[PDB]
Design an enzyme around this catalytic site. Structure first.
Site, PDB file in Angstrom:
ATOM      1  N   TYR B  86      -0.572  -8.212   3.509  1.00  0.00           N
ATOM      2  CA  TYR B  86      -0.445  -7.939   4.814  1.00  0.00           C
ATOM      3  C   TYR B  86       0.564  -7.013   5.983  1.00  0.00           C
ATOM      4  O   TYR B  86       1.609  -8.477   6.142  1.00  0.00           O
ATOM      5  CB  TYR B  86      -1.109  -8.478   5.878  1.00  0.00           C
ATOM      6  CG  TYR B  86      -2.578  -9.118   5.419  1.00  0.00           C
ATOM      7  CD1 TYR B  86      -3.417  -8.135   5.362  1.00  0.00           C
ATOM      8  CD2 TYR B  86      -2.980 -10.142   4.258  1.00  0.00           C
ATOM      9  CE1 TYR B  86      -4.435  -8.180   4.382  1.00  0.00           C
ATOM     10  CE2 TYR B  86      -4.586 -10.339   4.065  1.00  0.00           C
ATOM     11  CZ  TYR B  86      -5.427  -8.810   4.119  1.00  0.00           C
ATOM     12  OH  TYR B  86      -6.703  -9.060   4.557  1.00  0.00           O
ATOM     13  N   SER B  87       1.029  -6.324   6.091  1.00  0.00           N
ATOM     14  CA  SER B  87       2.349  -5.699   6.410  1.00  0.00           C
ATOM     15  C   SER B  87       2.194  -6.853   8.101  1.00  0.00           C
ATOM     16  O   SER B  87       1.206  -5.882   8.811  1.00  0.00           O
ATOM     17  CB  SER B  87       2.399  -4.361   6.822  1.00  0.00           C
ATOM     18  OG  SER B  87       2.052  -3.692   5.492  1.00  0.00           O
ATOM     19  N   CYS B 267       2.314   5.027   6.772  1.00  0.00           N
ATOM     20  CA  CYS B 267       1.533   3.531   6.337  1.00  0.00           C
ATOM     21  C   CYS B 267       0.537   3.794   6.560  1.00  0.00           C
ATOM     22  O   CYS B 267      -0.511   3.678   7.636  1.00  0.00           O
ATOM     23  CB  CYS B 267       2.860   2.744   6.801  1.00  0.00           C
ATOM     24  SG  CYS B 267       1.962   0.468   6.788  1.00  0.00           S
ATOM     25  N   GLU B 307       4.189   2.936   2.341  1.00  0.00           N
ATOM     26  CA  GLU B 307       3.730   2.243   2.136  1.00  0.00           C
ATOM     27  C   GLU B 307       2.124   2.214   2.144  1.00  0.00           C
ATOM     28  O   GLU B 307       1.737   2.107   3.226  1.00  0.00           O
ATOM     29  CB  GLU B 307       3.965   0.994   3.180  1.00  0.00           C
ATOM     30  CG  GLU B 307       3.520  -1.000   3.068  1.00  0.00           C
ATOM     31  CD  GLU B 307       3.876  -0.843   1.452  1.00  0.00           C
ATOM     32  OE1 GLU B 307       5.284  -1.750   1.288  1.00  0.00           O
ATOM     33  OE2 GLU B 307       3.008  -0.838   1.179  1.00  0.00           O
ATOM     34  N   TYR B 309      -1.932   2.079   0.732  1.00  0.00           N
ATOM     35  CA  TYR B 309      -2.244   0.806   0.312  1.00  0.00           C
ATOM     36  C   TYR B 309      -3.722   0.906   0.195  1.00  0.00           C
ATOM     37  O   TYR B 309      -4.434   1.617   0.550  1.00  0.00           O
ATOM     38  CB  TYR B 309      -2.590  -0.672   0.506  1.00  0.00           C
ATOM     39  CG  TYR B 309      -2.393  -1.178   1.906  1.00  0.00           C
ATOM     40  CD1 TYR B 309      -3.646  -0.715   2.528  1.00  0.00           C
ATOM     41  CD2 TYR B 309      -1.290  -0.811   2.904  1.00  0.00           C
ATOM     42  CE1 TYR B 309      -3.224  -0.707   4.135  1.00  0.00           C
ATOM     43  CE2 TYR B 309      -1.117  -0.857   3.875  1.00  0.00           C
ATOM     44  CZ  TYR B 309      -2.308  -0.408   4.756  1.00  0.00           C
ATOM     45  OH  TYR B 309      -2.235  -0.750   5.821  1.00  0.00           O
TER      46      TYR B 309
HETATM   47  C1  LIG Z   1       2.059  -3.700   0.874  1.00  0.00           C
HETATM   48  C2  LIG Z   1       0.489  -3.935   1.202  1.00  0.00           C
HETATM   49  C3  LIG Z   1       0.584  -3.643   2.288  1.00  0.00           C
HETATM   50  C4  LIG Z   1      -1.198  -3.687   3.529  1.00  0.00           C
HETATM   51  N1  LIG Z   1      -1.095  -4.487   4.525  1.00  0.00           N
HETATM   52  C5  LIG Z   1      -2.605  -4.697   5.094  1.00  0.00           C
HETATM   53  C6  LIG Z   1      -2.791  -4.280   6.670  1.00  0.00           C
HETATM   54  O1  LIG Z   1      -1.117  -4.631   7.032  1.00  0.00           O
HETATM   55  N2  LIG Z   1      -3.440  -4.850   7.109  1.00  0.00           N
HETATM   56  C7  LIG Z   1      -4.697  -4.236   5.991  1.00  0.00           C
HETATM   57  O2  LIG Z   1      -5.657  -4.562   7.110  1.00  0.00           O
HETATM   58  N3  LIG Z   1      -4.426  -4.688   4.728  1.00  0.00           N
HETATM   59  C8  LIG Z   1      -3.920  -4.294   4.282  1.00  0.00           C
HETATM   60  N4  LIG Z   1      -3.175  -4.209   3.321  1.00  0.00           N
HETATM   61  C9  LIG Z   1      -4.713  -4.562   2.111  1.00  0.00           C
HETATM   62  C10 LIG Z   1      -5.282  -5.337   1.726  1.00  0.00           C
HETATM   63  O3  LIG Z   1      -4.663  -6.681   1.119  1.00  0.00           O
HETATM   64  C11 LIG Z   1      -6.695  -5.857   1.383  1.00  0.00           C
HETATM   65  O4  LIG Z   1      -6.415  -5.276  -0.172  1.00  0.00           O
HETATM   66  C12 LIG Z   1      -7.432  -5.726   2.365  1.00  0.00           C
HETATM   67  O5  LIG Z   1      -7.877  -6.680   3.745  1.00  0.00           O
HETATM   68  C13 LIG Z   1      -9.014  -6.243   1.609  1.00  0.00           C
HETATM   69  O6  LIG Z   1      -9.044  -8.003   1.364  1.00  0.00           O
HETATM   70  P1  LIG Z   1     -10.518  -8.385   1.215  1.00  0.00           P
HETATM   71  O7  LIG Z   1      -9.909  -9.441   0.427  1.00  0.00           O
HETATM   72  O8  LIG Z   1     -10.532  -8.635   2.232  1.00  0.00           O
HETATM   73  O9  LIG Z   1     -11.387  -7.872   0.444  1.00  0.00           O
HETATM   74  P2  LIG Z   1     -11.549  -7.719  -1.323  1.00  0.00           P
HETATM   75  O10 LIG Z   1     -12.691  -9.413  -1.668  1.00  0.00           O
HETATM   76  O11 LIG Z   1     -10.904  -7.895  -2.413  1.00  0.00           O
HETATM   77  O12 LIG Z   1     -12.538  -6.704  -1.807  1.00  0.00           O
HETATM   78  C14 LIG Z   1     -12.410  -5.537  -1.906  1.00  0.00           C
HETATM   79  C15 LIG Z   1     -13.648  -4.467  -1.126  1.00  0.00           C
HETATM   80  O13 LIG Z   1     -14.172  -4.543  -2.070  1.00  0.00           O
HETATM   81  C16 LIG Z   1     -15.710  -4.807  -1.155  1.00  0.00           C
HETATM   82  N5  LIG Z   1     -16.403  -5.513  -2.180  1.00  0.00           N
HETATM   83  C17 LIG Z   1     -16.505  -6.660  -2.094  1.00  0.00           C
HETATM   84  N6  LIG Z   1     -17.768  -7.678  -3.291  1.00  0.00           N
HETATM   85  C18 LIG Z   1     -18.038  -5.942  -3.676  1.00  0.00           C
HETATM   86  C19 LIG Z   1     -19.349  -5.820  -4.370  1.00  0.00           C
HETATM   87  N7  LIG Z   1     -20.533  -6.437  -4.964  1.00  0.00           N
HETATM   88  N8  LIG Z   1     -20.241  -4.693  -4.537  1.00  0.00           N
HETATM   89  C20 LIG Z   1     -19.411  -3.450  -3.322  1.00  0.00           C
HETATM   90  N9  LIG Z   1     -18.705  -3.924  -2.759  1.00  0.00           N
HETATM   91  C21 LIG Z   1     -18.146  -5.017  -2.758  1.00  0.00           C
HETATM   92  C22 LIG Z   1     -15.088  -5.636   0.364  1.00  0.00           C
HETATM   93  O14 LIG Z   1     -16.101  -5.400   1.180  1.00  0.00           O
HETATM   94  C23 LIG Z   1     -13.837  -5.307  -0.020  1.00  0.00           C
HETATM   95  O15 LIG Z   1     -14.410  -3.556   0.821  1.00  0.00           O
HETATM   96  C24 LIG Z   1      -2.519  -4.074   1.937  1.00  0.00           C
HETATM   97  C25 LIG Z   1      -2.183  -4.115   0.935  1.00  0.00           C
HETATM   98  C26 LIG Z   1      -0.767  -4.058  -0.044  1.00  0.00           C
HETATM   99  C27 LIG Z   1      -0.912  -4.287  -1.298  1.00  0.00           C
END
Ligand SMILES: Cc1cc2nc3c(=O)[nH]c(=O)nc-3n(C[C@H](O)[C@H](O)[C@H](O)COP(=O)(O)OP(=O)(O)OC[C@H]3O[C@@H](n4cnc5c(N)ncnc54)[C@H](O)[C@@H]3O)c2cc1C
Ligand code: FES
Lengths: 97, 309
Positions: B86-87, B267, B307, B309
């Protein structure tokens, strides 16, 4: 222990530097004035992708590559700890899909 | 007048902190607050989370934090959840000018049956919902800080910085702008041009508008701010308005700055780049330049910062 990591650019350019077994290769390389490709720097993407020729690393701190990709020799250099001397080819992001 | 920040020794570090805390042994932080940033018409929720790290996990603007949500990896039994990045949306002093906290701008990831449009809570984002569901006092597994690509170039306090963002992509820029305009940092007196382009779904989806509109009033000569509300505005051909469309409205102006040594940053979710690049390509060509060559040069000059993602 400190190992020697030898890198191979996408054109045969090579770089050999010291790499503590408790330091990520990306950082060990930059310390020695070697510029490598990177993005998140936290094992979340493939920008730093590389591919082992010889040796082994611990990149468990990473989560972008799946078992299969890792089986083939692919490593995320920003979260890889050298476990021995290695020969790694850089800029392999292009091979991942 | 600028807000006093402390402690100043946070300016002493020559190199940025990196990986102070790894996944196997994350720092246990405490949630200070959580608030929705959007109105009822926003497609989904995006929240502002303040975290208390007590000065143990300091960072530099542009860097990110790692959060390990509770539970086990659904793809690897017995293993803990993968860290989500998370940024950081706060300066190194944090929203408390403390040097004690940091902030995240988190979009709630939710699932909806493509047809019945009903949300399936079982299929939504684990970490993002975990974060936006947090309350004051909750503990959070924090790792990092990490990243170097979005570090703000300060060698030239009068440099020009063009910031293109979408959704949560505005996070690091909120960090830059508080540092350039709101905080009293003796060793960094910004006197250049900060230009922020932010694209969101609708006005109910605007993030930190009062904050940015504030800079437009206090520093008219140093801060430009253009918003794009995709579901409420339209481009020249009648389609939805996007950031590249707003960038196009200032094409010549923007290319001058780049030609003059301006830094440009991108970003947010990665699906924002294709359109951006195409627009840049068309703008470089309407000027007789090769986009590939210019990109290569911009990167060479270290003016290109992405940046996504
Ligand atoms: C360098 C970097 C910076 C970032 N900065 C930010 C930031 O500032 N703010 C931000 O919000 N995010 C940011 N992200 C993204 C963040 O890290 C996550 O990837 C994001 O919040 C989603 O994670 P999660 O754990 O909620 O979802 P996850 O559980 O990982 O799921 C990913 C997606 O899969 C879907 N999903 C899960 N299970 C199923 C299923 N069975 N069927 C269908 N779909 C499904 C979820 O609903 C979701 O949309 C950044 C990523 C990187 C690499
Ligand atoms: S730079 Fe993203 S995983 Fe290494």
């Amino acid at each position: 222990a400190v190992y020697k990591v030898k890198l191979v650019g996408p054109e045969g350019e090579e770089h050999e530097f010291d790499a503590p077994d408790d330091a990520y290769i990306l950082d060990a390389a930059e310390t020695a004035g070697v510029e490598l490709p990177y993005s998140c720097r936290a094992g979340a993407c493939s920008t730093c992708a590389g591919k082992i020729e010889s040796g082994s690393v611990d990149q468990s701190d990473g989560s972008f590559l799946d078992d299969g990709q890792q089986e083939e020799g692919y490593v995320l250099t920003c979260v890889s700890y050298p476990k021995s001397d290695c020969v790694i080819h850089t800029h392999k992001e292009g091979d991942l899909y | 007048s600028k807000v006093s920040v402390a402690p100043l020794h946070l300016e002493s570090a020559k190199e940025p902190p990196l990986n102070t805390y790894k996944p196997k042994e994350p720092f246990t932080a405490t949630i200070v607050s959580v608030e929705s940033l959007v109105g009822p018409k926003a497609p989904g929720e995006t929240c502002h989370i303040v975290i208390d790290h007590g000065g143990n996990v300091p960072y530099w603007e542009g860097q990110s934090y790692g959060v390990i949500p509770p539970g086990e990896n659904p793809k690897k039994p017995g293993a803990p959840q993968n860290v989500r990045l998370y940024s950081i949306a706060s300066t190194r002093y944090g929203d408390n000018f403390d040097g004690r906290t940091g902030s995240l701008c988190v979009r709630r990831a939710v699932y909806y049956d493509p047809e019945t449009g009903k949300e399936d809570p079982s299929k939504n984002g684990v970490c993002s919902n975990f974060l936006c569901n947090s309350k004051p006092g909750d503990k959070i597994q924090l790792t990092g800080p990490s990243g170097k690509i979005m570090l703000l170039p300060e060698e030239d306090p009068n440099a020009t910085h063009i910031m293109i963002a979408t959704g949560t992509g505005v996070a690091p820029f909120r960090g830059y702008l508080r540092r350039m305009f709101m905080e009293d940092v003796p060793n960094y007196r910004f006197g250049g041009l900060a230009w922020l382009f932010l694209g969101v779904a609708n006005s109910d989806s605007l993030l930190y508008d009062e904050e940015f509109t504030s800079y437009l009033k206090q520093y008219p000569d140093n801060f430009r701010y253009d918003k794009v509300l995709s579901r409420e505005q339209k481009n020249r051909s009648g389609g939805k308005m996007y950031v590249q469309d707003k960038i196009e409205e200032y094409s010549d102006e923007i290319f001058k700055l780049l030609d003059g040594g301006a830094h440009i940053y991108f970003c947010g979710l990665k699906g924002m780049m294709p359109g951006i690049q195409d627009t840049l390509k068309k703008v470089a060509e309407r000027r007789g330049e090769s986009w590939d060559q210019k990109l290569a040069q911009l990167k060479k000059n270290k003016q290109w910062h992405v940046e996504v993602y």
